Amino acid sequence: APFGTLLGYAPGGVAIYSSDYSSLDDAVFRSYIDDEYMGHKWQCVEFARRFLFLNYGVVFTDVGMAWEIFSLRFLREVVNDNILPLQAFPNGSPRAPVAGALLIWDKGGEFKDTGHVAIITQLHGNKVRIAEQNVIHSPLPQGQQWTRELEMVVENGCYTLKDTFDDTTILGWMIQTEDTEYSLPQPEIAGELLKISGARLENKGQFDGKWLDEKDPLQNAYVQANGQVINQDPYHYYTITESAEQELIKATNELHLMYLHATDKVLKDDNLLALFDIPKILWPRLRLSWQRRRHHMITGRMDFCMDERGLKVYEYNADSASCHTEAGLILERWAEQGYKGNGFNPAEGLINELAGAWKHSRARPFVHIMQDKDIEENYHAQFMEQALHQAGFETRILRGLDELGWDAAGQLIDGEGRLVNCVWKTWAWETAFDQIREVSDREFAAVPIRTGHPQNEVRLIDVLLRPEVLVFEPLWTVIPGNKAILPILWSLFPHHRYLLDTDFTVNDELVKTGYAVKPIAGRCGSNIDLVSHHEEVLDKTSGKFAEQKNIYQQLWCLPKVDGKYIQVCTFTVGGNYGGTCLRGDESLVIKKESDIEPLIVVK
């Protein structure tokens, strides 16, 4: 049948649609049940996630290809943002495949690159029935709630399934259970595949003059702030394998889920929330934000240490992150200007990824962009306006707060008298929180915002905390963006392969490993102390956050490659991977001024 024709249903009344597109017949492809994303119409993964969500209220994280599901080790229980264990069993297992189980195909043969996923609906003595999308594209017999049956051989308590295809490879099945018996250990990637490698373009003088296009306003805003410069030596770049990017993608999606799970735990317990030093008057507002804008985050940036020892996350800049322009535009132009290879810039789709996120946000039609008066934020703010524009929103850029004012009744208006009720900001929420802390000893029954002023002087907090102004990033993002969340994540996922032991005191293990001291609300590599296991100060930075509470994180130094310490960063857009970029510095501490290093992912 044509694309999206209803073919029948799997157990429980879960539809099965034809996913046959033809050359003869982009946001419309996103399949959602409420605010929960099921996948892409009407692929194998979309059916499997929807089946699991409609029948058991659970879902698995975003994956590029179906075969990757087999590498996952948990499922998110949607109604309470809970995390359940998911075990994997290889085909030919003592662990029989029960109804409800995920059945995964590695890539290969009939499922060439994608691999495949289906749901086991019923087990028999010598076969199982399964349901799936993207195999059967014709209507199923009336009332039949399975698409295919696969023969199952049961020898000596071992179970083996055989496909109806002759060139495919069945990885195995998956069960949501705490019972690890017979299960496969979580796949671990070979260190060597994570090594970052230096490389060099041929010098044909490609970066001699004005290589950035000064006709493009965005690029020129970038030059006004930085010159025709990305890194020290533009002829030099670094590369990472595709296996490595795949690993980056996987960790980004998983850690985003871990962080929102620890955010939920935080907001559910005053003792945990207290650890963040956020003004108590905001607490109920933080809870309400989390409840109603749960799915409204547009973008954030994770900072990682990646090399042969593995993948580790230092932090998640979820409130207000930048580098998007550098990764998604300047490096594109850099590649266009001088890269002649087969590889690619892992951040190439960032602008479109952002546009999609905005299309599916609940942002108002007109969005005011609030940036500070720093030429450096100009391009960041304009790069985002480009995504907003592409998604169909109207915008106006506010530089500083001077243009903002109030009518007689106190409504917030811009320099043109237009009402400001939706803003995307470059300002960190914490900056506004400082305005409440300044008058901490006053007895306000509410966030002390102004609804009027003789001189019409509008402060940041007078915009961001007006109840009817719809702000992005949402207020709750200050929680995953606050390093006080690291000890909590370590407590929730002790010894997780991507986490570093982090604590509020230098505990015993940190003593022996050496640690990094970081302010909980700092950024840009400010006020950071790196202390060795030999108890010597390896490095230290200055900055405005010296008075804040600090956390202590197990020392795990950036690798040094081709003379520079290299840090890997990934972007999240709507909660999922949206790209990777590199920061390189002569020291162990990346900072606001550290270079962005051209990165090419090679297959």
CA distances from 50 to 118, 238, 597 (A): 11, 39, 40
Annotated binding-site residues for glutathionylspermidine read 43, 49, 63-66, 134
Smallest distance from ligand ADP to CB 494, Å:
17
Does residue 581 have an active-site annotation?
A: no
Instruction: Give the interface with ligand ADP as residue ranges (CB under 6 A).
Output: 303, 314-315, 500, 516, 518, 522-526, 528, 530, 553-558, 567, 588-590
Whether omega before 211 lies within 30 degrees of 0, making that bond cis, reads no
Would you say 75 or 588 has its CB closer to ligand ADP?
588
Contact partner, 79, from ligand ADP, a second copy, Mg ion, none, Cβ < 5-8 Å per class? a second copy
Contact with Mg ion (CB under 5 A) among 317, 325, 345, 550: 317
The count of residues interacting with a second copy (CB under 8 A) is 60
Binding to Mg ion by residue 303, rule CB under 5 A?
A: yes
Residue 79: how many CA atoms within 13 Å on its side-chain side?
Answer: 5
Report the alpha-carbon distance of residue 583 to residue 138 in Å, rounded: 51
Residues 433/278, Cβ–Cβ less than 8 Å: yes
Binding to Mg ion by residue 322, rule CB under 5 A?
A: no
Could you give the 3-state DSSP secondary structure of residue 141? coil
Binding to a second copy by residue 56, rule CB under 8 A?
A: yes
Question: What's the gap between Cα 14 and its chain centre?
Answer: 29
- As to burial, measured by CB atoms within 10 angstroms (0-12 exposed, 13-18 middle, 19+ buried), residue 147 is buried
Number of other CB atoms surrounding residue 445 within 10 Å? 6
Tokens linked to 325: 């322009």
Would you say 210 or 533 has its CB closer to ligand ADP?
533
Contact with a second copy (CB under 8 A) among 28, 79, 190, 439: 79
Binding to a second copy by residue 139, rule CB under 8 A?
A: yes
Pairing verdict, β 515-519 and 529-531? antiparallel
CA distances from 269 to 276, 281, 351, 564 (A): 12, 15, 37, 42
- As to burial, measured by CB atoms within 10 angstroms (0-12 exposed, 13-18 middle, 19+ buried), residue 148 is middle
Note the maximum CA span of the chain.
86
Report the alpha-carbon distance of residue 20 to residue 389 in Å, rounded: 32
Contact partner, 545, from a second copy, Mg ion, ligand ADP, none, Cβ < 5-8 Å per class? none
Residue with tokens 């690890």: 180
Spell out, one character per residue from 449 to 488, where the chain touches a second copy: x when CB under 8 A holds, - when not: xxxxxx----------xxxx--------------------
Catalytic member of 44, 305, 422, 569 = 44
Tokens linked to 126: 């010598």
Q: Which residues contact 439 (CB under 8 A, 6 or more apart)?
A: 448
Contact partner, 409, from a second copy, Mg ion, ligand ADP, none, Cβ < 5-8 Å per class? a second copy
Binding to Mg ion by residue 95, rule CB under 5 A?
A: no
- In the region spanning residues 222 to 281, those forming contacts with a second copy, defined by CB under 8 A, are 268
Rg (CA), the chain: 26
Residues 240/304, Cβ–Cβ less than 8 Å: no
Annotated binding-site residues read 43, 49, 63-66, 134, 301-303, 315, 317, 320, 376-377, 431, 483, 518, 524-525, 553-556, 567, 588-590, 595
Binding to a second copy by residue 409, rule CB under 8 A?
A: yes
Contact partner, 556, from a second copy, Mg ion, ligand ADP, none, Cβ < 5-8 Å per class? ligand ADP
Contact partner, 518, from ligand ADP, a second copy, Mg ion, none, Cβ < 5-8 Å per class? ligand ADP
Smallest distance from a second copy to CB 143, Å:
3
- In the region spanning residues 278 to 337, those forming contacts with a second copy, defined by CB under 8 A, are 284-285, 287-288, 290-292
Report the alpha-carbon distance of residue 238 to residue 256 in Å, rounded: 26
Smallest distance from Mg ion to CB 332, Å:
23
Report the alpha-carbon distance of residue 601 to residue 603 in Å, rounded: 7
For residue 512, what is the DSSP state?
Answer: H
Binding to a second copy by residue 99, rule CB under 8 A?
A: yes
The residue range among 144-152, 215-223, 517-525, 579-587 that interacts with Mg ion, by the rule CB under 5 A, is 517-525
Smallest distance from Mg ion to CB 583, Å:
8
Smallest distance from ligand ADP to CB 158, Å:
45
Binding to Mg ion by residue 503, rule CB under 5 A?
A: no
Would you say 469 or 517 has its CB closer to a second copy?
469
Map 152-173 to HEC letters.
EEEECCEEEEECCCCCCCEEEE
Residues 42/4, Cβ–Cβ less than 8 Å: yes
The residue range among 3-11, 194-202, 250-258, 319-327 that interacts with a second copy, by the rule CB under 8 A, is 3-11
Report the alpha-carbon distance of residue 388 to residue 104 in Å, rounded: 38
Q: Show which residues are catalytic.
A: 44
- Give contact residues for Mg ion (rule: CB under 5 A): 303, 315, 317, 523
- Give contact residues for a second copy (rule: CB under 8 A): 6-14, 34, 54-58, 78-80, 98-100, 119-123, 139, 142-145, 268, 284-285, 287-288, 290-292, 406, 408-411, 443-454, 465-468
